[PDB]
Design a protein around this ligand. Structure first.
Ligand SMILES: CCCCCCCCCC(=O)N(CCO)C[C@@H](O)[C@@H](O)[C@@H](O)[C@@H](O)CO
Ligand SMILES: CCCCCCCCCC(=O)N(CCO)C[C@@H](O)[C@@H](O)[C@@H](O)[C@@H](O)CO
Ligand SMILES: CCCCCCCCCC(=O)N(CCO)C[C@@H](O)[C@@H](O)[C@@H](O)[C@@H](O)CO
Ligand SMILES: CCCCCCCCCC(=O)N(CCO)C[C@@H](O)[C@@H](O)[C@@H](O)[C@@H](O)CO
Ligand code: NA
Ligand code: NA
Ligand code: NA
Ligand code: NA
Ligand code: NA
Ligand code: NA
Lengths: 90, 92, 91, 91
């Protein structure tokens, strides 16, 4: 559980660093700095407007953006589910 | 389960009191009174338009509003999941 | 002449903005929360930009008779502006 | 005559587009990221299409005094265009 949460923090911070570099200049409201990127990737993890609100507008500039966002969702959503179940069982 | 539901009610009511004070004057449609705040925080808990519809517009006026809403989601979402699983287990 | 028309529009914009802040400022603080915000919104209403779908219909869900304020304001300002612009061309 | 008015509008559109790219290009790259994008957006602003709900209100959330740029631009361009179009009809 402790290591699971530690892995989720490392993944989250790395992805937010990656996103700031990739989409920061073209999408500064969602990825303009590390703080904006951490907030946006938390929203994308909760699946809230991830495609219509964020990734479809981003794909209009960066057509391969789905290679970043779909594996991010698959990874964080699975880990969050695994972590919350882990706390309840332990 | 009973205590879990009791904790969720106390958390929900306290947060709705907090939100009415914080965002009531600047966002009266969503937090103008305790009834509006309880409804909005139920919507935020279900994750429905929580960021695009509510917290991003709120952050344009109150930049630190994420310090309220992200811990609220993390807490209530985890508790609801824990409560629903608890009812199912204490039935089998 | 033109000067009196430009002054008339200024007075109308000030009176309507004070009134809009007073009536709708508590319920709609983004568009009418203070004189500056109201002056900006009333200008947007005069240009007919989202005046109904974006401003007046949301306001009427709280203040049902709000159309009595905004429809006469549109009728007055879009007439005054039409008269002012044609007035400058003639003179 | 008409030629000088059409040239005046061209110069104004170039100066405002360079200024809009310089001021708002980093924070709003879709509408002001370069001269081409700004020229397109300023034309859209002149036609009064979503100028406030779609462009200026989002910009003012980052640049609060942005209204001092866009409101005088609208007042100037919608006047020049009105004078130009009436000018062609007369001549
Ligand atoms: C799972 C771990 C989740 C961690 C989430 C951390 C979020 C931190 C957000 C933050 O520090 N902000 C700056 C507060 O000063 C908010 C930004 O996102 C904000 O600048 C933008 O959203 C603007 O566009 C709003 O006007
Ligand atoms: C569970 C398995 C999920 C698999 C998901 C695969 C997605 C593959 C998407 C893809 O290959 N695109 C083309 C990338 O070249 C993206 C398209 O959506 C694209 O045609 C455009 O809509 C955007 O690029 C926006 O303009
Ligand atoms: C008489 C002819 C019309 C003249 C219009 C004058 C507008 C002056 C607006 C002003 O002084 N502001 C303060 C900043 O300089 C603008 C803001 O108060 C407001 O427009 C928005 O920022 C809010 O609606 C955001 O919620
Ligand atoms: C050129 C002549 C234009 C005259 C316009 C007269 C409008 C009269 C409107 C009216 O009498 N209302 C009743 C209350 O005063 C308002 C409502 O009928 C309506 O505008 C909306 O509030 C609804 O659509 C909401 O679902
Ligand atoms: Na969902
Ligand atoms: Na949605
Ligand atoms: Na949704
Ligand atoms: Na329009
Ligand atoms: Na429109
Ligand atoms: Na129009």
């Amino acid at each position: 559980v402790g290591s699971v949460a530690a892995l989720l923090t490392v993944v989250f911070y790395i992805a937010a660093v990656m996103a700031t570099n990739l989409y920061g200049a073209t999408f500064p409201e969602w990825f303009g700095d590390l703080s904006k990127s951490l907030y946006t990737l938390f929203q994308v993890m909760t699946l809230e407007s991830w495609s219509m609100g964020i990734v479809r507008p981003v794909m209009n500039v960066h057509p391969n953006a789905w290679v970043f966002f779909i594996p991010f969702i698959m990874l964080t959503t699975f880990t969050v589910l695994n972590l919350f179940i882990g706390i309840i069982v332990d």
